[PDB]
Amino acid sequence: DIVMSQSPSSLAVSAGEKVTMSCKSSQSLLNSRTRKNYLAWYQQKPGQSPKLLIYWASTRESGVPDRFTGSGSGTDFTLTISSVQAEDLAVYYCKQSFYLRTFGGGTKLDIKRADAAPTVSIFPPSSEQLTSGGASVVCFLNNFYPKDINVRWKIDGSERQNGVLNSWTDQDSKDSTYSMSSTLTLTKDEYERHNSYTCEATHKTSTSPIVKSFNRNE
Amino acid sequence: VQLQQSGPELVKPGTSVKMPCKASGYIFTDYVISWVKQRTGQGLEWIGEIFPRSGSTYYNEKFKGKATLTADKSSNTAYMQLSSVTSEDSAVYFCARDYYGTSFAMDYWGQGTSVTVSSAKTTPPSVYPLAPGNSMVTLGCLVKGYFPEPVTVTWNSGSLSSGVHTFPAVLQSDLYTLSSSVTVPSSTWPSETVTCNVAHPASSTKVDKKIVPR
């Protein structure tokens, strides 16, 4: 019945900066078993299974780089990352194994990088889909930063607000960027009543919205 | 060392699911297997552990009477069985090797079994090519109207890796839709063929959609 508490819940730093995060246990994790505190640190990159980083409060697991350093004793513990890399994008959990097991609720690590304008791409519906009666128009917005972005769909100049499904990638561990998908889905019937289709992106990197269009005929 | 979990599973409310974790590269009886739950966008959550040498178990209070941890020495396989399941049990479930005796740490983890609890029916995806309407060209794949999650997307059977984004699925009224974008040199397409490969474990569907111009 031991609880684990992590803070901060979230964290952001630029590549190269140092970061520190804290984990506290409701009771002592130390023992008669040598100096040992039974506390571990785990890393989870988006889509991936967890990875053990540190055990015994301070000891590096094999194949974990030295820029990861865990510390603390009793009921107070710390993970420090010196020289944060884009690839350290992850959630970090702390875990007690002094009695049974209990995980922390995690500290999410976000990376801060330079600003980056999106590659915007527009894709009309496919022949296959149209044949079966749907009309999905997809707009990709790729490799931008910061994550704050807004999309507007225009059919023949009029903004359209339903049938729109958006999805954001987790932050990219190679270049620290984000990407986004937007799909506007209509009936084929509704799609064949108009010509010009436009996706408009509003981002910090341009004062003027980034536009891509196509014409159903042309 | 490896821990091999079953593929993604759709199960009905009120029923059971039993998932395996097949162990290898080590002495099965010298370590404990521990099991961990993770709900969509939530933290990790420990379920319990089993010491295969003896068969003895421990449980997070939370999961007593819900989760039954078993093991098989002869085939180096640990099992977790969930009973009388509800939407609450829909999650990814990991098995992990815990170095009971010292580290008391989970040094190796399985790929995790994605379990969805719903009486909804398995629907294979409709996969659509996305061909476009400065050297670098972007193309895509639309993966629409499937259930349950997950699907696996690759491009030229994984040979094209860099410059691929697969976007998270989004749920609309019992069906999932997601998409993937791939970005190659404008020099390589369509002069060379590009195909997206969609796999939906729950229906065992594998679709290959070739991206053709126009």
């Binding site: 994790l29 023992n31 078993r33 040992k36 039974y38 194994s97 002094f98 009695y99 049974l100 097991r101 | 404990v32 010491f51 040498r53 003896s54 003895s56 421990y58 009971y100 010292t102 008391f104």
Partner: peptide
């Protein structure tokens, strides 16, 4: 089979 390092 003990329940953690603290035995």
């Amino acid at each position: 089979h003990v329940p953690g390092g603290g035995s």
